[PDB]
Amino acid sequence: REGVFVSNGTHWFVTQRNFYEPQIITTDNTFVSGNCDVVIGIVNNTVYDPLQPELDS
């Protein structure tokens, strides 16, 4: 949504463009558009959905 994806080598984070604050990638800090196929250099990772452990109560 804002900022950029990065990896420390083993894990993927989203972070601000101008200051490294690694945030876990979630359905709140990211937006979807279409399926994988079209994007040159897309990568595979989990994106966490904050709602699911809450409704899992």
Partner 1 sequence: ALQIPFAMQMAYRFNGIGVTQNVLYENQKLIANQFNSAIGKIQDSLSSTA
Ligand X SMILES: *[C@@H]1O[C@H](CO)[C@@H](O[C@@H]2O[C@H](CO)[C@@H](O)[C@H](O)[C@H]2NC(C)=O)[C@H](O)[C@H]1NC(C)=O
Under the binding rule (CB under 8 A), the answer on residue 19 touching partner 1 is: no
Q: Which residue has the tokens 């979807």?
A: 32
33 by Cβ neighbours in 10 Å (0-12 / 13-18 / 19+) ranks as exposed
41 binds partner 1 per the rule CB under 8 A: yes
**Which option in partner 1, ligand X, none does residue 55 bind, with CB closer than 5 to 8 A by kind?**
none
Q: What number of other Cβ atoms are within 10 A of residue 30's Cβ?
A: 12
Partner whose binding site includes residue 11, from ligand X, partner 1, none (CB under 5 to 8 Å by kind): ligand X
Which residues of the chain form contacts with partner 1 (CB under 8 A)?
A: 4, 17, 31, 33-34, 38-41
